[PDB]
Amino acid sequence: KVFGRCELAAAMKRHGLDNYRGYSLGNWVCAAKFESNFNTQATNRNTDGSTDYGILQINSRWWCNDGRTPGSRNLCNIPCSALLSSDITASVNCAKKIVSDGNGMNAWVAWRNRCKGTDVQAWIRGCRL
Numbered sequence: 496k497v498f499g500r501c502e503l504a505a506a507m508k509r510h511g512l513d514n515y516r517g518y519s520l521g522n523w524v525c526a527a528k529f530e531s532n533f534n535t536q537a538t539n540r541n542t543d544g545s546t547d548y549g550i551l552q553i554n555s556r557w558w559c560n561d562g563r564t565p566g567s568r569n570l571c572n573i574p575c576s577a578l579l580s581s582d583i584t585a586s587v588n589c590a591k592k593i594v595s596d597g598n599g600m601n602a603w604v605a606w607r608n609r610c611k612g613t614d615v616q617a618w619i620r621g622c623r624l
């Protein structure tokens with residue numbers, strides 16, 4: 496599923512991301528834009544053998560099991576395929592654990608490099624939320 500901007504903002508808000516760990520909703524929408532271009536089915540293979548899955552490109556070395564990431568953990572206790580669903584619940588629940596790992600949303604390098612310090616509220620303006 497390719498979410499619309501405002502559609503995804505609404506779904507993230509219903510699942511509790513607005514101001515989660517202090518990050519306003521626009522930060523989450525911006526991160527999804529530059530991680531996945533709002534495409535729940537996005538995957539990207541890393542040179543180290545791990546794979547990033549879904550709307551927030553969550554990585555298999557620590558956070559989900561895909562059965563092909565040597566030496567990995569599964570700290571969100573989910574199959575990585577669950578992060579590709581049109582229902583974003585599993586991605587949101589796992590993202591909540593990630594943003595708690597001490598680096599906040601710097602855990603998403605695309606957030607740090609492309610969203611951090613910008614007018615992220617522009618991502619939710621004009622959205623019914």
Ligand SMILES: CC[C@@H]1CN2CCc3cc(OC)c(OC)cc3[C@H]2C[C@H]1C[C@@H]1NCCc2cc(OC)c(OC)cc21
Nearest residue numbers: 500525528529609610613614615616617618619620621
């Ligand atoms: C309501 C307008 C969209 C919302 N903004 C949020 C702020 C923002 C920040 C960006 O980088 C930090 C950014 O980079 C790509 C985009 C945005 C936008 C996205 C807006 C515009 C919109 N995106 C989908 C379709 C489209 C097509 C466009 O031209 C064909 C266009 O021209 C300006 C804008 C957009």
